[PDB]
Design a protein around this ligand. Structure first.
Ligand SMILES: [Zn+2]
Lengths: 375, 373
């Protein structure tokens, strides 16, 4: 099927330049090309009028938790909520995310319901973003992602690699293989609260993950855990609130991405923005991530503002949500509107490079070939 | 050891009369007698001055839960608290109860830590009231005393007689025997939610087993139908009997079972029902279900019983004579020769203003003085 987007302004994020009065030709789910002017439909074709709009690639958020959203009772709800309850809330969370304009997300934590949500969205059952999920986070015993942490001794039990808790390299191998068996796209670990992973454990995780084509994302606020993860060869660091100048040189030599998460934890202080500034000025690779869930879903665009207020130019923020995100995912057909890519397109009212806050009201959303939002 | 109490006013609860300016002579843990005047002490005899005070027997509360106390977080607390945490909290709960003047209590529900608390208090390890506990309450699956109620299915499991959840007469027999094995003094079951949760055959099995092992049966019941099933089964006490039919009151009088209102906890109606019950001549024993209310505020219930029309003397009798009768002990609840020295003292006449019981100035248990303020 053929859909033509008559775009007044279309953002070339690789060039960094707006293209004025162009047509995007989409056949099926793929962008077939960009044509100057507005092209009449030679044969009956679907045309969408975005001439008064600014057009962007579908934004991607590389830190979301689609299973949960914070609530006065999350800690009790951990004991009272069943998988079906989690799924039914995730429905609305995913819909709000997709209609905020984020066509792709990287889910870094759940009970495994996230895998079912991705499969159900991909099957056409529920409206949502393309989800690349880590499934269950991997932690060491008592680690941040240990599922039975804080339980009464009777309800605590002894979680092992099947549950995502590993101690020692071989157990780590089984835990990564278990996440692969469960259908995870990537691996996420909790490296600090103190470093919760030894160098050999991290090496085991990174090598196993690379064997199965899974990247490694690392949640770490402490400096030593970040430096261990970076030396091990992990692909991304989350938050990293305290960063050693040594961690910045590690970032630069390894090429790992830094996902700031300024939005989440703003709620929980301002250190994180200071850290982000020092990272961006240093030349650290940056990918866009909000940690949605602690922050209400569909308010991810707020993070854009916070990144620009910290000194990141709007083009570089939008590139962090598009080009850098697609590179971090390991996908080559998303994050830029050009021939051969997947038709993930959003559109806003005003110039996002002159005011980034325009991104918090997305008026047009199309994921794959299908249009989900056209206000 | 010998102690003399110089009591300005001492309440003879049996005759309902004050005796003025008397001496209570206690040897060891037992009341040896009441003498005219303030008897002058011989050497080695200790004397406590209650000449400005009103002196009454130790109060007893027949619905308390010493393991827990209410807070915005009880529902999350169960998933996080271990038995030791519960014991350490219970320590303070018991101490505050004893200093409120309640020298004897009937703990009607716990996880079994209540049993260890009773054994520890009786061993002299922890300051506390004389405790008579049901241990773990028995309920049917989904009953109010079901331990895994509301848990996610992964954590809920299938609780059975070992856990206090029984279905059918044989499981009930085993659950009562399990409480006996664990060291409980009495059995407590939850017969209603308002929907009735124990079948007549189940109730008969429970009371007959309890009767074999010398244990009384107390029943938490809010609904009328479960209340009447329990009363027909032959239970000893009905607790929180809200929504009570007039026919149930006739059953009450024929069975002789006690009605424990727990008006204080039901302030969260109960008062209208308690008023009708008291007017009908039902046997009433004092109970607060403190635990859901802060421990140490038990005396407030006294107030409410007088507010519903019960005369102060009968409220004090419900906390003393009626309570001791319901427990099945013959040496507690009245200051007279041959009984155990559980004695409290207050500032004003409790029969003219019962709220004076909320300021207990003197507490004596088993001959020992815990409070003399
Ligand atoms: Zn997170």
């Amino acid at each position: 099927a053929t859909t033509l987007l008559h775009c007044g302004h279309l953002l070339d994020v690789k060039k960094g330049k707006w293209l004025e009065g162009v047509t995007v030709r989409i056949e099926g789910n793929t962008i077939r090309g960009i044509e100057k002017g507005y092209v009449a439909p030679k044969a009956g074709e679907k045309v969408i009028d975005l001439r008064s709009r600014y057009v962007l690639p579908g934004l991607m958020d590389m830190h979301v938790h689609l299973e949960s959203e914070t609530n006065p009772h999350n800690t009790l709800e951990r004991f009272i909520l069943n998988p079906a309850d989690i799924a039914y809330r995730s429905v609305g969370y995913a819909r709000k995310t997709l209609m905020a304009g984020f066509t792709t997300v990287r889910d870094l934590g759940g009970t495994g319901v996230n895998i079912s949500l991705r499969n159900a969205i991909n099957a056409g059952l529920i409206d949502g973003p393309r989800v690349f999920t880590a499934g269950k986070s991997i932690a060491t015993t008592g680690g941040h992602a240990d599922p039975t942490n804080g339980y009464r001794k009777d309800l605590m039990g002894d979680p092992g690699p099947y549950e995502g808790v590993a101690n020692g390299p071989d157990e780590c191998r089984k835990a990564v293989r278990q996440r692969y068996k469960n259908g995870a796209d990537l691996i996420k670990i909790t490296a600090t609260g103190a470093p919760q992973f030894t160098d050999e454990e991290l090496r085991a995780i990174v090598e196993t993950a690379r064997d199965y084509g899974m990247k490694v994302a690392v949640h770490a606020h402490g400096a030593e855990g970040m430096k261990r993860a970076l030396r091990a060869g992990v692909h991304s660091i989350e938050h990293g609130t305290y960063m050693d100048d040594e961690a910045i040189e590690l970032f630069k030599k390894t090429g790992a991405y830094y996902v700031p998460t300024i939005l989440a934890g703003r709620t929980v202080g301002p250190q994180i923005q200071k850290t982000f500034a020092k990272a961006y000025k240093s030349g650290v690779k940056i990918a866009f991530g909000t940690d949605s869930g602690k922050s209400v879903h569909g308010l991810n665009a707020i993070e854009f503002e916070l990144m620009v207020e910290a000194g990141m130019p709007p083009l570089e923020a939008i590139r962090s949500a598009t080009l850098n995100a697609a590179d971090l995912l390991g996908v080559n057909n998303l994050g830029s509107i050009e021939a051969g890519m997947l038709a993930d397109v959003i559109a806003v009212e005003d110039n996002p490079l002159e005011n980034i806050s325009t991104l918090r009201k997305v008026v047009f959303v199309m994921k794959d070939g299908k249009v989900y939002k056209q206000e």
